[PDB]
Design an enzyme around this catalytic site. Sequence first.
Site, PDB file in Angstrom:
ATOM      1  N   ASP A   1       0.938  -1.558   0.315  1.00 13.37           N
ATOM      2  CA  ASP A   1       0.277  -0.153   0.253  1.00 13.37           C
ATOM      3  C   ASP A   1       0.963   1.194   0.398  1.00 13.37           C
ATOM      4  OD1 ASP A   1      -2.220   1.898   0.010  1.00 13.37           O
ATOM      5  OD2 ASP A   1      -1.491   2.308   2.265  1.00 13.37           O
ATOM      6  N   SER A   2       0.677   2.059  -0.188  1.00 12.70           N
ATOM      7  CA  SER A   2       1.114   3.352  -0.561  1.00 12.70           C
ATOM      8  C   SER A   2       1.502   3.501   1.058  1.00 12.70           C
ATOM      9  CB  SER A   2      -0.150   4.689  -1.105  1.00 12.70           C
ATOM     10  OG  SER A   2      -0.783   4.808  -0.204  1.00 12.70           O
TER      11      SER A   2
ATOM     12  N   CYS B   1      -4.084  -1.589  -2.076  1.00 10.64           N
ATOM     13  CA  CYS B   1      -3.683   0.719  -2.855  1.00 10.64           C
ATOM     14  C   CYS B   1      -4.636   0.898  -3.815  1.00 10.64           C
ATOM     15  CB  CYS B   1      -2.492   1.125  -2.917  1.00 10.64           C
ATOM     16  SG  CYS B   1      -3.063   2.691  -3.697  1.00 10.64           S
TER      17      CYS B   1
ATOM     18  N   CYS C   1     -11.312   3.191  -2.707  1.00  6.72           N
ATOM     19  CA  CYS C   1      -9.893   4.052  -2.039  1.00  6.72           C
ATOM     20  C   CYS C   1      -9.537   3.270  -0.011  1.00  6.72           C
ATOM     21  CB  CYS C   1     -10.178   5.400  -1.625  1.00  6.72           C
ATOM     22  SG  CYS C   1      -8.950   6.466  -0.660  1.00  6.72           S
TER      23      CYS C   1
ATOM     24  N   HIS D   1      -8.775   4.545   1.912  1.00  8.01           N
ATOM     25  CA  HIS D   1      -9.520   5.787   3.338  1.00  8.01           C
ATOM     26  C   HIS D   1     -10.882   5.418   3.581  1.00  8.01           C
ATOM     27  CE1 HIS D   1      -5.041   6.051   2.758  1.00  8.01           C
ATOM     28  NE2 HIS D   1      -5.733   6.781   3.612  1.00  8.01           N
TER      29      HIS D   1
ATOM     30  N   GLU E   1      -6.252  10.924   7.498  1.00  5.90           N
ATOM     31  CA  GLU E   1      -5.471  10.225   8.462  1.00  5.90           C
ATOM     32  C   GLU E   1      -5.651  11.319   9.901  1.00  5.90           C
ATOM     33  OE1 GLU E   1      -2.044  10.652   5.177  1.00  5.90           O
ATOM     34  OE2 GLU E   1      -2.813   8.174   4.863  1.00  5.90           O
TER      35      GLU E   1
HETATM   36  N1  LIG Z   1      -4.174   3.839  -0.974  1.00  5.41           N
HETATM   37  C1  LIG Z   1      -4.269   4.712  -1.849  1.00  5.41           C
HETATM   38  C2  LIG Z   1      -5.525   6.815  -1.201  1.00  5.41           C
HETATM   39  C3  LIG Z   1      -4.079   7.341  -0.406  1.00  5.41           C
HETATM   40  C4  LIG Z   1      -3.415   7.411  -1.775  1.00  5.41           C
HETATM   41  O1  LIG Z   1      -3.059   8.500  -1.930  1.00  5.41           O
HETATM   42  O2  LIG Z   1      -2.127   6.947  -1.739  1.00  5.41           O
HETATM   43  C5  LIG Z   1      -5.660   4.742  -2.455  1.00  5.41           C
HETATM   44  O3  LIG Z   1      -5.979   3.306  -1.555  1.00  5.41           O
HETATM   45  O4  LIG Z   1      -6.447   4.960  -3.171  1.00  5.41           O
END
Ligand SMILES: N[C@H](CCC(=O)O)C(=O)O
Lengths: 248, 247
Positions: free
Chosen positions: A7-8, A70, A181, A183, A150
């Site tokens: 993940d990011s 992600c 997404c 989040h 976040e």
């Molecule tokens: N993990 C990203 C959200 C956070 C980011 O922008 O890196 C997503 O699922 O889109």
Amino acid sequence: MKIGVFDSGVGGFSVLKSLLKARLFDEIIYYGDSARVPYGTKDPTTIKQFGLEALDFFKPHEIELLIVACNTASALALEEMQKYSKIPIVGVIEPSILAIKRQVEDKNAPILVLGTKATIQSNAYDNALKQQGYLNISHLATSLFVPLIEESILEGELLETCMHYYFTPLEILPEVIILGCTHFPLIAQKIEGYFMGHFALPTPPLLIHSGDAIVEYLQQKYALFPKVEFHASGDVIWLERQAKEWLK
Amino acid sequence: MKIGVFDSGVGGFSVLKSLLKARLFDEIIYYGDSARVPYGTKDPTTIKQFGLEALDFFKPHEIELLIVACNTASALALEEMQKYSKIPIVGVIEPSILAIKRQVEDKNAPILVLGTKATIQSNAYDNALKQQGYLNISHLATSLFVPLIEESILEGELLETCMHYYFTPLEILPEVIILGCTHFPLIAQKIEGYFMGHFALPTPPLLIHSGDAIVEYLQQKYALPKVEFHASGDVIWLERQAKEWLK
Ligand SMILES: N[C@H](CCC(=O)O)C(=O)O
Ligand SMILES: O=C(NC[C@@H]1Cc2ccccc2CN1c1nccnc1F)c1cccc2[nH]ncc12
Ligand SMILES: N[C@H](CCC(=O)O)C(=O)O
Ligand SMILES: [Cl-]
Ligand SMILES: [Cl-]
């Protein structure tokens, strides 16, 4: 069985949570690119290179499956990662499309895709829905949800005002909302409440959650308490402190 | 004379704008680390490494001076970058302290420092202010201002609600507000309007603008154009932003 989750940053914990409660694996190597998060505000070239580089991180961990938790990386990089990769890589977009087929039989039901700017701009969700017959698809980049969540702004007038800002322009009233997404599950109830309260809606729209969908997919492919390794490009302790809160 | 300007992304354009207006330099190499922005929500270890890598970027360019336009990198990485640089590196914290010394005679005047979480956590502003004798210092991380401003949310209910969220717990009524972040000049008027309203002020607080402070500092210190833009992300996206930020 030993898999990695990419993940990011820390939003991947919403997918990690569903994977843990399904206890389908013995060992999970989580890697969050917290030094460079977020991906959603950046461009396709950068994002693709990020995904390729994540491949190199997992090489020495000898995993047999990589879950790209992600949605942004799944939308922009998964194809390129799959080319360069000998183990299978499952993203979170296609599994959600399968869950939509199972839970949404009316191909005219208005579906709203929510995601990062990069995810929405790629049209990954819209193209895959269209290829499966759906004819009433809307999409909305809700970029500011990521930094709000976040910062743990999960209720109150700031979140409400952010939702109203994104949702007030909506032409169509959605029957289905895709949480495209990592989040967005943390404010799922609040998104539901918005649509029930702002429109004359007795019941809320149906929300598709990326972690629950990938788990359903993965259960239709593999067999029935896992160890978890946490790695980060940023401070791994900061990421672990985050994990404790997300996995509640 | 040819200089470098380093920032985490496009925020640095608020410093570049001041430099361009002052017509100080013939040649400017702007580098924005837009693949990795924002720095301000990240950790001191990561940011210092980011700073050192910024130095490698400017090596082939033969600059005479590096301006670290980013307040977060100025606060966490500048000491380390100067350890490894033969050319002078100037950050945007020290010039702002001089701007305040020049403009704020009263040592009890309440000063409010706004910046990223990392900038605020470092205490770089408070420590420099206390060293100069200022007695009434407050600080506030206003993290969400950065993504709001990058979305061009420069007015309206959402920005006003974000300001109220950050400013409501304020104990002190500031006479001075340090815009300790590249992005905050874009909402300077809105911040002034917020504090004039909620404390019934006849005149706005004094806002300290990092870009204006560094210009004044470089002029005093050095008795004093072609820009090329570089990015770690898509440089076309960064130049598109340059048009909007630079007026
Ligand atoms: N993990 C990203 C959200 C956070 C980011 O922008 O890196 C997503 O699922 O889109
Ligand atoms: O290791 C544990 N705690 C410390 C570790 C680092 C750390 C540092 C500063 C603030 C918080 C944290 C939380 N941490 C993690 N929290 C969740 C997942 N992984 C982690 F590494 C741990 C052990 C057994 C049961 C637990 N329940 N919750 C945590 C634990
Ligand atoms: N340039 C940063 C703001 C954006 C970021 O966090 O990288 C600063 O001045 O603090
Ligand atoms: Cl949270
Ligand atoms: Cl802007």
